[PDB]
């Protein structure tokens, strides 16, 4: 593996340069406000983001060392988690707002769809509020997003081939080291390093929860023939039954 060879600083540099771009939506203020067309914008946006995410994942240290079937599984498991942490990250400097796109700033009032959707919205807002209060750094965010990719489906997987799961654990341990390294460089005491590390990883539990609840709505959406779900998004969604 090349990932197990990288220093913490090389790990950070690798992740930073593998960062996907922030895409625009097709939002138009001069257009009417059909919360089913909001989901239209988001679906269209998510679908274009998936293509960048897939090519981003292949540049995550250790990811392409895995089989194609294992790469597929991890992405199927984590895609909405990864979209959501990205959403929460870019919404940090916008209290009470979610920045889905540079041209798409929605609060809970320009709303929605509601009871359930407003809940997911509130949860995303809370998470963003957490990142802001923690003063989450860009270097920490790219570590967290990479952890999600590798962790979210590290279980839930044939025979013999199981050392690949071991390899994922090794890479995860390295990213842990990288996180601590960043905090140590930031001048945090040992106690503060352990606490911040815990705080960060507990947030992943919230991101997991939001993804599962979001997946429920998307499945509920799909069957009602609301938004026209794209071909890739339909396949990613069916993976979660």
């Amino acid at each position: 593996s090349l990932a197990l060879s990288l220093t913490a600083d090389q790990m950070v540099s690798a992740l930073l340069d593998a960062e996907p771009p922030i895409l625009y939506s097709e939002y138009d203020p001069t257009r009417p406000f059909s919360e089913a067309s909001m989901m239209g914008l988001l679906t269209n946006l998510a679908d274009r983001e998936l293509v960048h995410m897939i090519n981003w994942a292949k540049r995550v240290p250790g990811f392409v060392d895995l089989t194609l079937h294992d790469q597929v599984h991890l992405l199927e498991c984590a895609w909405l988690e990864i979209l959501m942490i990205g959403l929460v990250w870019r919404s940090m400097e916008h209290p009470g707002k979610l920045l889905f796109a540079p041209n798409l700033l929605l609060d809970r009032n320009q709303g929605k769809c509601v009871e359930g959707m407003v809940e997911i919205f509130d949860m995303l807002l809370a998470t963003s509020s957490r990142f802001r209060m923690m003063n989450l750094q860009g270097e920490e965010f790219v570590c967290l997003k990479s952890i999600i990719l590798l962790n979210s489906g590290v279980y839930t997987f044939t025979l013999k081939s199981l050392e690949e799961k071991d390899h994922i654990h090794r890479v995860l341990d390295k990213i842990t080291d990288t996180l601590i390294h960043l905090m140590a460089k930031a001048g945090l005491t040992l106690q503060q390093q352990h606490q911040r590390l815990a705080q960060l990883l507990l947030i992943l539990s919230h991101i997991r929860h939001m993804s599962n609840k979001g997946m429920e709505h998307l499945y509920s959406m799909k069957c009602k023939n609301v938004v026209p779900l794209s071909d890739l998004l339909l396949e990613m969604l069916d993976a979660h039954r």
Binding site: N55, L75, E76, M236
Partner: peptide
């Protein structure tokens, strides 16, 4: 799958 195809490219 589409995902498997894009991962092969």
């Amino acid at each position: 799958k589409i995902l498997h195809r894009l991962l092969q490219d």
